[PDB]
Design a protein around this nucleic acid. Structure first.
Ligand SMILES: [Mg+2]
Ligand SMILES: [Mg+2]
Ligand SMILES: [Mg+2]
Ligand SMILES: [Mg+2]
Ligand SMILES: [Mg+2]
Ligand SMILES: [Mg+2]
Ligand SMILES: [Mg+2]
Ligand SMILES: [Mg+2]
Ligand SMILES: [Mg+2]
Ligand SMILES: [Mg+2]
Ligand SMILES: [Mg+2]
Ligand SMILES: [Mg+2]
Ligand SMILES: [Mg+2]
Ligand SMILES: [Mg+2]
Ligand SMILES: [Mg+2]
Ligand SMILES: [Mg+2]
Lengths: 97, 87, 95, 196, 140, 287, 53
RNA sequence: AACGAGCUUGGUGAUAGCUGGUUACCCAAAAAUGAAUUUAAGUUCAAUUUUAAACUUGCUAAAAAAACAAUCAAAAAGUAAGUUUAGAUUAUAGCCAAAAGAGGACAGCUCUUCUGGAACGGAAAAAACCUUUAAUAGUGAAUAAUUAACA
RNA sequence: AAGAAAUUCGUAAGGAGCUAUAGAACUAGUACCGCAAGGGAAAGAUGAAAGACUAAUUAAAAGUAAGAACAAGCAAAGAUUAAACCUUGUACCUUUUGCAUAAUGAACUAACUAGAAAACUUCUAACUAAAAGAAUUACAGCUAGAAACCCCGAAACCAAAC
């Protein structure tokens, strides 16, 4: 194989930037705040998987439910095919029955 | 262009061996190299042989006429071992 | 068996089991004797007596049905006047 | 709790196309036999340069889970003791400072032997003194949070912890309520006979 | 390409560094070197327990040569030396012949005498005092 | 403590020092090594190794075991059978002992659930709580308990100690509000009427011996006395008892809560109760 | 160790470092260096005694 | 420019009980018999095997006596395993020697039953016969089968 | 295999992503290929200044050269004063029965290229006749964590264009 003939540039991480310093604050907003807000409400992400977890087939179906009607034609077609592939895998294949 | 700094580092040392071994540098006295104190090493020399030595006398033995002349010239720009050699 | 259903993503009960077997909460399964309604005119009286009974399932058969039914069919049911009230528990069994 | 404060938020956006989503690869490249080459049904397969990944990251993934309410509350109690016993917790009446100059706060920490990184907790965000607000904002290591925002991860990252007296009472009631309580008949936010 | 092996260079080096002295493409190609090296390691392991049997066969050749100079077959030399209660392994006997020829003659004569004594004992039946060297010391 | 003292000596706790509890995690075996690679645990070449073996319950082609047994009605009508979460007298006495039920006040399904004495799931066909005979001997408490189903011996324990036991029917809609009142008040809808029992349950709740709420008041005395003779105790005089009004308290057959009439609205935010003045609505609610 | 072997000059040079390293010099001029990264005191003590012998 | 029925795109990552492949170390235990199957290039169950747990007798042997060299088995003794419970597969074609039946109350041949084996040592040949309790460093040692026969 | 509803509940700029065989097919729907529908690439790398004669950087892949060969043999190992002579040794994988002198597959190098899910079980904790941040389960349970089930390949079938 081949390896670099020079050392790559040093990578410097500032561990006291604002994002890292205050990471985690308000994770106990509920228990310490009279349960006004559940901590799951603080997650920033796709609408269909805020405060939710599942396997890919479940993830595929959940993406369709929330934004199935606002998706592009090609993206929706690929999602439908992705669901049908996963369905036959998880429900008809695998070592265990 | 793969990730990481470590793979380059291991190879940089591989480059080190290639250059040094193919074109070795001229020998350098152990004094110039790190981890050298004259007095401590002199003490160990006597202990290693198991023979008690007079440290001051042993120091003069290692001194040579050539070394003195070079030092004096550098200073411009401490007794020899000749008597010990004869005895 | 549907291990992950499209609409909900859950396991699906096989209804062929729900219509043939009864599960007691301990883990036992009840069943009928195949043919207990068939050609009774040529079966001996002792033979017919055996068929009318309710029979238990083995460890393997019980294990199978537990894979083909969902937890809802494995819960506690507090039916008033249940004729299977006393049979949902095992007593004086050391094993 | 420390791992929880890492994972539940996590959402990963790494994604790789599969062999069907890759552009092209519809026609069969060549006949099975007669050419002396291996049998392929699409120029976009996992065995082909430019093909689709075999088992790669798919879509956005979520790592969301919540520990039980008592478990996460217990973590706060544990973290509080650890700082106290190791002489990292300092109890203060109020956060009032003589001057807003950040230099004073940094110098004071060294004089009192506090750690480089200090976490300051006040009862409520709205009432916090203006003098502290100016000083802490200019300082990276000295991070100021309100009482309700206390978390295990913050305490672990910060060497010393400064607690105001009212905040200690606030934390003491909240955590000690978690034990001696029933199991919620409802979501707690709904009206309760004896809960604020 | 999220994760790729950045140190595969040294993994190949481990196999290749054990193949330089070979001839042909096996000394430089990993697909070919690796197969060659395994056999080299296996033979090295199956030859650690063959130099302990050949080195003994070498000794028997040289002891057979040594005794024959003095007129004794190998079986007679070794057996009689033991029967005299003197225990010398086949490694020093070869050393003695090569570097101490005069001492070996003493061993050859001593082994020969016991052989004669053994022949006399069988030839002469009955209660007779055995040869001076025939006498066997006992340890309790 | 002594264990706490050790922590003081040890170095500062930080994010680097974190360790999972012993044996909490397991090694995840991957297929990259000889033991777990190559054939990768799937055996030789075959259907099960190609990943495409048949479904569960498929016995090779003979009629499967689960399909070859006669269908029987063990589970027929299960979703419509009535469930009563039973309550024993040991649990009742145990709850009263620890101060999680107020015996002086009348007891109902709401105050059982509030004190977590019982757990009720209306969505799973629960129709209330049935009192059970277990623990009668240890029961020495006088209490006015309302339970949808009662038993002969359970009644004896309540009556012998000088208590009132009544049985009332709550329909699926009524039960949900009874177990969980507060949210219903948050919905903003008016309180509903409580429907009478269906034909199947009419005989039970109109029977004097079962202490039915719709039962004839006149026949109670005789029924109690006959039970008193049967179990060898003398009927106590509740009227003489100081708390006769509380014990005798019984909600209207169309009432979910003792002190609230159908059709009212509760405003928790303003701390007020709103009652309709419309004659038409009053007619409907009064019914 | 220093007193037990008085013919072995011992240099200890604590520095900001990633791997602790022991360098052994013999009288014939041969050098030998062994990595001590994350080794307990028991391992080092046994390791050093091999070098002296 | 290969028509028993064109070609291109899409369905489509068609499906394949079939062929091929499936990437670090170390320690340990470890088998092609019975049943059903559009079944005999497959699967499922029994039997075997295995990881854990529970608690107590298990293996060889087993006198008399039965039912006739076995089916059964009591005191013993030599010895450490056996039963129950929970979880889980792969496997379901053998190969060769030596014994004994049974097919035409034959040898053979095809089956069936019991026994053994899978060297680096030996037997012109040499996975199957004979000597061989695991694997480790040593320029130690005693040995096994065998190294043909002298009728 | 499919699968409700009634009825409850809700105010909602970032990257433990890729970095030239990766990420889009893309420097481009271009070159090229097909009458047409249509299919479909590859690659680049100096410095602050080139109005400083385009840098660097590397025993580093296969392949060669420098330097053809010298009785004898899976090409090595034990060795040895000595490179070869002497002794020992039936390529690898898959595969067949647990055997190959078989039969498949590999000219060599670099990069890429195949095990994925939590019903039941085990292990680890929180609280405990109760556990769960609403609907769930309970005759010691309940909650949370960790722990699992691949890749490539037909002849075909249908729709719509050409
Ligand atoms: Mg496609
Ligand atoms: Mg096509
Ligand atoms: Mg295909
Ligand atoms: Mg791609
Ligand atoms: Mg896995
Ligand atoms: Mg059939
Ligand atoms: Mg319930
Ligand atoms: Mg068998
Ligand atoms: Mg078939
Ligand atoms: Mg088949
Ligand atoms: Mg590209
Ligand atoms: Mg491309
Ligand atoms: Mg080269
Ligand atoms: Mg040779
Ligand atoms: Mg080839
Ligand atoms: Mg396939």
């Amino acid at each position: 194989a081949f390896v670099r003939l020079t050392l790559p540039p040093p990578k410097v991480v500032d561990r006291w930037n604002e994002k890292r310093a205050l990471f985690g604050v308000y994770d106990n907003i509920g228990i310490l705040g009279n349960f006004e807000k559940h901590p799951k409400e603080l997650i920033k992400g796709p609408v269909w998987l805020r405060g939710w977890r599942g396997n890919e087939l479940q993830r595929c179906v959940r993406k369709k439910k929330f934004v199935g009607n606002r998706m592009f034609i090609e993206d929706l077609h690929n999602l439908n095919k992705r669901i049908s592939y996963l369905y036959k895998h998880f429900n008809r294949h695998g070592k265990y029955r | 262009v793969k990730k990481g700094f470590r793979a380059a580092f291991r190879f940089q040392k591989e480059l080190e061996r290639w250059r040094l071994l193919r074109c070795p540098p001229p020998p350098v006295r152990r004094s110039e190299k790190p981890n050298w104190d004259y007095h401590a090493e002199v003490q160990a020399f006597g202990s290693r042989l198991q023979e008690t030595f007079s440290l001051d006398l042993l120091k003069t033995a290692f001194i040579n006429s050539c070394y003195i002349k070079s030092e004096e010239a550098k200073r411009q720009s401490l007794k020899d071992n000749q008597e010990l050699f004869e005895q | 068996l549907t291990y992950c259903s499209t609409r909900k993503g859950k396991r699906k009960t096989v209804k062929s089991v729900v219509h043939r077997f009864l599960r007691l909460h301990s883990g036992l399964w009840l069943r009928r004797k195949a043919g207990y309604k068939k050609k009774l005119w040529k079966k001996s009286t002792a033979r017919k007596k055996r068929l009318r009974e309710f029979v238990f399932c083995s460890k393997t058969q019980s294990k199978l049905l537990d894979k083909m039914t969902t937890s809802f069919w494995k819960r506690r049911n507090w039916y008033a006047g249940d004729p299977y009230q006393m049979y949902h528990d095992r007593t004086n069994l050391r094993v | 709790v420390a791992i929880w404060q890492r994972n539940f938020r996590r959402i990963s956006y790494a994604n790789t196309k599969t062999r069907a989503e890759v552009s092209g690869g519809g026609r069969k490249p060549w006949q099975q036999k007669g050419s002396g080459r291996a049998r392929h049904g699409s120029i976009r397969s996992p065995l082909w340069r430019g093909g689709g990944v075999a088992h790669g990251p798919r879509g956005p993934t979520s790592y969301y889970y919540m520990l039980p309410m008592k478990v996460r509350a217990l973590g706060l109690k544990v973290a509080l003791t650890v700082k106290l016993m190791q002489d990292d917790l300092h109890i203060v009446d109020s956060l009032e400072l003589p001057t807003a100059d950040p230099q004073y706060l940094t110098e004071l920490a060294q004089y009192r032997h506090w750690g480089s990184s200090v976490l300051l907790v006040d009862l409520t965000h709205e009432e916090m003194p203006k003098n502290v607000v100016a000083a802490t904002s200019g300082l990276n290591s000295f991070n100021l949070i309100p009482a309700v925002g206390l978390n295990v991860y913050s305490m672990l990252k910060h060497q010393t912890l400064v607690l105001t007296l009212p905040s200690v009472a606030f934390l003491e009631d909240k955590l000690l309520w978690q034990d001696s309580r029933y199991t919620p008949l409802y979501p707690f936010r709904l009206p309760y006979s004896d809960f604020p | 390409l999220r994760n790729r092996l950045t140190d595969r260079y040294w993994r190949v080096q481990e196999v290749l560094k054990h193949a330089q002295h070979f001839r042909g493409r096996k000394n430089r190609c990993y697909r070919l070197a690796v197969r060659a090296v395994t056999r080299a390691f296996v033979k090295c392991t199956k030859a650690r327990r063959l130099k302990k049997r050949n080195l003994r066969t070498l000794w028997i050749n040289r002891i057979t040569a040594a005794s024959q100079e003095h007129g004794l077959k190998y079986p007679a030399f070794i057996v009689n030396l033991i029967k005299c209660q003197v225990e010398l392994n086949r490694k020093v006997l070869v050393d003695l012949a090569i570097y101490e020829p005069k001492t070996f003659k003493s061993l050859a004569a001593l082994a020969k005498r016991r052989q004669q004594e053994g022949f006399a004992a069988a030839l002469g039946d009955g209660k007779e005092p055995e040869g001076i060297f025939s006498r066997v010391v006992q340890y309790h | 403590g002594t264990s706490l003292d050790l922590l003081r000596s040890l170095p500062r706790v930080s994010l680097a020092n974190l360790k999972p509890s012993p044996n909490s995690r397991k090694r995840e075996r991957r297929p990259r090594d000889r033991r777990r690679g190559r054939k990768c645990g799937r055996g030789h070449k075959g259907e099960r190794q190609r990943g495409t073996r048949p479904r569960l319950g498929f016995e090779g082609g003979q009629t499967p075991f689960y399909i070859r047994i006669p269908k029987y009605g063990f589970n027929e009508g299960h979703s419509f059978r009535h469930q009563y979460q039973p309550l024993s007298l040991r649990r009742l006495q145990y709850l009263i002992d620890l101060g999680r039920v107020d015996p002086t006040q009348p007891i109902d399904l709401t105050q059982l659930v509030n004190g977590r004495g019982v757990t009720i799931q209306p969505l799973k066909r629960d129709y209330g709580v049935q009192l059970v005979e277990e623990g009668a001997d240890t029961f020495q408490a006088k209490i006015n308990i309302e339970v949808q189903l009662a038993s002969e011996l359970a009644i004896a324990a309540i009556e012998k100690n000088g208590g009132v036991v009544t049985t009332a029917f709550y329909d699926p809609r009524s039960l949900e509000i009874l177990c969980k009142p507060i949210p219903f008040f948050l919905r903003g809808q008016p309180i509903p009427k409580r429907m009478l029992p269906p034909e199947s349950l009419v005989p039970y709740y109109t029977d004097a011996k079962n202490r039915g709420y719709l039962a004839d008041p006149a026949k109670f005395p005789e029924a109690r006395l006959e039970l008193a003779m049967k179990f060898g105790y003398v009927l106590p005089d509740i009227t003489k008892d100081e708390l006769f009004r509380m014990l005798s308290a019984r909600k209207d057959p169309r009432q979910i809560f003792f002190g609230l009439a159908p059709g009212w609205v509760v405003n928790m935010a303003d701390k007020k109760i709103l009652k309709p003045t419309d004659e038409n609505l009053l007619k409907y609610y009064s019914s | 160790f220093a007193r037990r072997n008085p013919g072995v000059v011992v240099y200890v040079n604590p520095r900001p470092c990633a791997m602790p390293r022991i360098v052994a010099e013999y009288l014939n001029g041969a050098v030998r260096e062994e990595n001590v990264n994350s080794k307990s005191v028991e391992e080092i003590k046994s390791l050093v005694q091999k070098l002296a012998d």
